[PDB]
Design a protein around this ligand. Structure first.
Ligand SMILES: Nc1ncnc2c1ncn2[C@@H]1O[C@H](COP(=O)(O)OP(=O)(O)O)[C@@H](O)[C@H]1O
Lengths: 193, 436, 49, 97, 320
């Protein structure tokens, strides 16, 4: 849509439709910016919620961090409930304070992600092969432990020829080991995830 | 109110005969309050009996109590104000909190009148002696309106409109509209209430005018004020004014101009008097004497003692002797709060100890203010005799003494302290304090 | 000193205009509200100009 | 804690492909002089490993759609370990007329 | 065993001093003790016999703190004349006078390594000294007011401090500073003390805490209240595990028991308090002196508690 608007802006009778073209372009740029921030903040929040809910005994070691993320998560839950109650693109575009609220949420989630180095080092001590995984990628791996959808793009860093793994329909039993050229080996007995 | 009834009862609309019987009674009630709201109880009773004696409107069959004691119910019949609020039992935790208000006849009546005048966003002025309750009444009647947000303002002798302009710069914003400039609070959908606390005290000029009162009158009547920076008329959007003031016969106060006073209704709040005071603080005393169950029976005599000594001191020391001789229910509230704070950590105390706390608080409230040794001796002797009058068969020597001191320095709690031990402790602490 | 408050005196002098009192009040308010510091603000009658 | 640079940030963005940079044809072009200070860091990328190694132990495998390009004027300071890993397109002075 | 508590009356009431007694400590290897007062002297007392042994003149103003080393052959004393002296306790003579502070030095200690000395003075700075040379090597800043006491931890890697700044500040010695800043005291912070190694289990089971599950339970501080309280803290940014309300005046000295099962405390209420901190209550109260009690110490092996006071007397309490 933005490309088409910019194409018809140049030629040939743009002068009569100028104000409508500017309004269209402005609202398109605004929704582009809002959703560009939105995809990143949702991608951050999904693994932050995973790591702070599925993993336990973190409040006894980072109480202020856990309380801060609990408050931020309740705020995000309320905002997403409002978005669910207003599923219109124009409505979410014109929600008052959405841009600054989402920018502040991105900044706070970034700070929370930054303040996790000691816990990440403890996890790396727990599993030896996590030493070859970065901080953000390790955070995503821990947060999306139950999902098992983003582990296929991270297994190649940990292992030698294990590019990905094959799963069942329930996505709760590992069936084998898959390489990057399609060569696969079948387990003698699976693992009970 | 009729429209509210119509909205609340969609299946049964507002009938004509009920509307007539409601509106006639409300007209009598509104005439009474609008014409004698700024006068004493005797004068409003006189106006009520005059209306009852001249005008043929149905009225309650009240042999003694005035018509202003009654409320026009929405169903169209008179209802007493006293039956609205019963005896309440405030919790021990908030026994003298700054926001607790134990309901009373005058409190409920003034709250209803304030709500009526504040729902229409009409400016008003609360008049009465200091400490009578003209800020608790406004705040209690305005806590029932979530739309309203209070902004405190304390007028002085050298008050000039720049105080109002600084308040507007902080709490509101200027915006430009095609119709002109309007001024509105930054909180969207909220009404701002400016509570000017000493509205008489702005200094009257040589030619009988007050700049602040003229400014407020211009804003109330013309709906806006000129902005002196660019000489541009600035309109107001959601702003009202509420004034509190002592009577204009007080030593520092001046009478407001008639052009300003044309717009602001004035309601006169007086001191509660003895019969209201005894209940209005016996509730607090009964709540307070639950920390120590053995002191439960010593609540009515204690409240009578506080009320009686406060009345005696207020009658004795007046404004004409010294400028600061102002005694109000603020002193009783601080009395209850002091006894509660001295009783909270103890949870075991005999009646002599309770009387000692009561006498120490009486001293610290009614004797530190005084100037002359004769007045101080009068307060000491009268504290002793009021305590002996209201508390017979008590250990006078064990409950009263010449020093009577309380401190939390030598003890963890707030318990009485011996003078010699206190002197030794202060000497040692001064030895430490010289080097620090 | 016994109660742990920090004593503040404005230390008035000559040519002490209203801006200096505003600055002293600002510093007292900042210390007392932003930094949770209990302050005893002792002010004399000769300090009022 | 690790702070990314320009090349590492761009490569990590392409690897993550949050907005779908993997599907497009991505080219990384180095428009500057070549010396063994910073190209011996990239010799593992230009090697058969297709891999960038960092002091963390974090490794970033080069995706097949990304070509590492240099727009250089000369190679008088590059070493054999750099020249031997890349394909040469000698743009002579007579190519442009 | 691990249960003895001081009992009335006192064993000896040693009264050789001339001014208020400031700090009293025990000896690591010998059956002797030293005491510092405000008359610029450090008397040495045999607490087993109860007789004054010898004095250590040399300080110009009131000596404010004293501390032995691990071997027991060195005594480090700091005074209000802005100097720190190191005493050769084998021959009872001063080795070096170490200037450098700008005001009254309030407390010193010798690190468990044995060749470094900490300090604390009214200029809000903490300095590290060299025992071998006498030079200053490291200075700590961050406190906004008079620093009253400094205490290194068990292995010498961490330093805790208390100040008129209303705060307790603990940091690592080596390179980083301000590991935590503890701000739950509403008045001045006066007396800190670390927790001994044989106290972590009792502390963990006494306070609200899970069954470890983290490893290295973390160091624990103690009190420092001029607001008549006792407060112990934790690892990281620090939280108040418990507050032992029940005291009467300005707390001046706090300790753990040798077995780690009790908290000993003394204050200006002329009272030595024995806290059963597992139940957050004081189970024993000793009317120690006739004036303010300034300091106490607890013997690591022998059953003796010693207290100094403004009474110009040093009392030794035998434990039963
Ligand atoms: N129920 C009550 N009735 C009357 N006075 C009360 C009541 N509760 C508290 N007070 C005291 O009455 C005082 C009235 O002061 P305030 O509300 O500021 O009005 P004013 O502006 O007349 O002083 C308050 O300080 C309060 O302590």
């Amino acid at each position: 849509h933005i490309n088409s608007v910019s194409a018809m802006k140049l030629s040939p009778y743009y002068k009569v439709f100028e104000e409508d073209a500017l309004s269209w372009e402005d609202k398109l740029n605004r929704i582009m910016a809002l959703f560009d921030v939105w995809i990143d903040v949702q991608r951050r929040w999904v693994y932050l919620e995973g790591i702070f809910t599925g993993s336990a005994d973190i409040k006894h070691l980072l109480p202020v961090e856990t309380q801060r993320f609990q408050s931020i998560s309740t705020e995000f839950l309320a905002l997403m409930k409002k978005v669910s109650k207003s599923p219109l693109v124009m409505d979410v575009l014109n929600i008052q304070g959405v841009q600054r609220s989402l920018e502040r949420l991105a900044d706070l989630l970034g700070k929370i992600q930054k303040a996790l180095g000691e816990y990440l080092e403890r996890e790396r001590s727990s599993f030896p092969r996590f030493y070859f995984v970065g901080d953000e990628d390790l955070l995503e791996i821990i947060g999306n432990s139950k999902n098992v959808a983003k582990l296929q793009k991270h297994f190649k860093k940990m292992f030698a020829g294990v590019s990905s793994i094959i799963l069942n329909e329930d996505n709760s039993v590992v069936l084998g080991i898959s390489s990057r050229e399609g060569e696969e080996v079948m387990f003698k007995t699976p693992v009970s995830i | 109110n009729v429209a509210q009834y119509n909205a609340n009862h969609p299946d049964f609309p507002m009938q004509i005969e009920q509307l007539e019987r409601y509106i006639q009674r409300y007209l009598v009630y509104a005439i009474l309050w609008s014409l004698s709201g700024d006068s004493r109880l005797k004068m409003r009773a006189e106006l009520g009996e005059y209306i009852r004696r001249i005008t043929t409107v149905p009225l309650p069959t009240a042999p003694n109590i005035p018509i202003i004691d009654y409320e026009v119910s929405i169903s169209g019949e008179w209802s007493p104000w006293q039956a609205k609020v019963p005896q309440i039992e405030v919790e021990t935790h908030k026994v003298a909190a700054p926001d607790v208000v134990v309901p009373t006849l005058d409190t409920v009546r003034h709250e209803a009148l304030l709500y009526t005048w504040l729902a229409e966003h009409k400016p008003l002025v609360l008049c009465g002696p200091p400490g009578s309750g003209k800020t608790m009444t406004l705040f209690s009647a305005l806590r029932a309106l979530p739309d309203m947000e209070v902004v405190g303002l304390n007028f002085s002798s050298a008050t000039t409109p720049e105080l109002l302009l600084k308040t507007f710069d902080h709490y509101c914003e200027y915006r430009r509209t095609p119709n002109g400039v309007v001024l509105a609070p930054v909180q969207l959908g909220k009404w701002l209430v400016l509570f000017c606390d000493e509205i008489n005290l702005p200094d009257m000029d040589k030619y009988g005018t007050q700049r602040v009162i003229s400014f407020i009158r211009q804003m109330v009547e013309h709906g806006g004020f000129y902005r002196t920076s660019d000489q541009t008329w600035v309109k107001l959007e959601r702003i009202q004014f509420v004034g509190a003031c002592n009577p204009p016969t007080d030593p520092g106060r001046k009478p407001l101009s008639h052009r300003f006073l044309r717009h602001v209704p004035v309601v006169y709040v007086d001191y509660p008097g003895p019969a209201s005071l005894t209940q209005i603080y016996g509730t607090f005393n009964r709540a307070m004497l639950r920390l120590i169950p053995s002191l439960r029976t010593y609540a009515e005599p204690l409240t009578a003692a506080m009320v009686e000594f406060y009345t005696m001191s207020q009658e004795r020391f007046t404004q004409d002797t010294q400028p600061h001789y102002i005694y109000s229910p603020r002193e009783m509230t601080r009395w209850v709060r002091g006894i509660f704070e001295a009783l909270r950590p103890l949870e075991t105390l005999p009646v002599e100890g309770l009387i000692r706390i009561w006498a120490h608080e009486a001293l610290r409230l009614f004797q530190d203010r005084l100037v002359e040794d004769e007045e101080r001796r009068w307060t000491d002797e009268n504290i002793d005799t009021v305590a002996l009058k209201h508390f017979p068969n008590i250990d006078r020597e064990k409950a009263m003494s010449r020093p009577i001191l309380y401190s939390n320095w030598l003890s963890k709690d707030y318990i009485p302290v011996d003078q010699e031990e206190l002197r030794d402790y202060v000497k040692a602490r001064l030895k430490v304090f010289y080097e620090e | 000193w016994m109660n742990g408050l920090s004593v503040y005196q404005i230390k008035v002098h000559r040519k002490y205009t209203g801006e200096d009192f505003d600055e002293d009040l600002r510093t007292v308010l900042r210390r007392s509200g932003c930094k949770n510091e209990k302050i005893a603000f002792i002010m004399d009658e000769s300090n009022v100009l | 804690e690790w702070t990314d640079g320009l090349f590492t940030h761009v490569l990590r963005k392409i690897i993550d492909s949050v907005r779908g940079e993997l599907q497009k044809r991505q080219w990384i072009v180095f428009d500057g002089d070549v010396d063994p200070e910073w190209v011996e860091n990239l010799n593992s990328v230009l090697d058969d490993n297709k891999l960038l190694t960092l002091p963390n132990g974090e490794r970033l495998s080069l995706p097949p759609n990304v070509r590492i390009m240099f727009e250089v004027q000369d190679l008088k300071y590059a070493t054999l370990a750099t020249v031997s890993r890349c394909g040469m397109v000698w743009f002579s002075e007579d190519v442009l007329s | 065993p691990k249960e003895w508590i001081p009992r009335p009356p006192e064993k000896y009431a040693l009264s050789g001093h001339r001014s208020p007694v400031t700090r009293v400590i025990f000896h690591p290897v010998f059956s002797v003790m030293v005491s510092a007062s405000e008359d610029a002297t450090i008397k040495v007392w045999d607490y087993e016999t109860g007789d004054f042994e010898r004095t250590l003149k040399g300080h110009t103003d009131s000596v404010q703190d004293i501390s032995f080393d691990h071997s027991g052959k060195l005594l480090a004393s700091c005074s209000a004349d802005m100097t720190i002296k190191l005493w050769d306790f084998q021959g009872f003579e001063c080795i070096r006078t170490m200037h450098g502070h700008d005001h009254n030095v309030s407390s010193v200690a010798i690190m468990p390594n044995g060749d470094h000395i900490v300090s604390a003075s009214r200029d809000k700075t903490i300095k590290m000294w060299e025992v071998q040379t006498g030079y200053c090597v490291k200075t700590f800043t961050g406190h906004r007011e008079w620093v009253r006491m400094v205490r290194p931890n068990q292995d010498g890697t961490l330093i805790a401090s208390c100040s008129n700044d209303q705060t307790v500040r603990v940091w690592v010695v080596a390179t980083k500073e301000c590991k935590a800043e503890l701000r739950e005291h509403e008045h001045v912070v006066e007396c800190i003390s670390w927790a001994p190694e044989s106290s972590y289990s009792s502390i963990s089971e006494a306070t609200g805490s899970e069954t470890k599950k983290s490893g290295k339970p973390g160091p624990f501080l103690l009190s420092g209240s001029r607001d008549k309280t006792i407060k112990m803290w934790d690892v990281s940014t620090g939280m108040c595990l418990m507050t032992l309300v029940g005291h009467d005046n300005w707390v001046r000295g706090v300790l753990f028991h040798s077995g780690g099962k009790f908290i000993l405390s003394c204050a200006d209420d002329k009272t030595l308090r024995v806290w059963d901190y597992k139940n957050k209550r004081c189970m024993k109260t000793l009317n120690a002196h006739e004036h303010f009690v300034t300091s106490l110490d607890f013997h690591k092996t022998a059953p003796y508690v010693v207290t100094g006071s403004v009474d110009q007397t040093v009392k030794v309490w035998e434990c039963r």
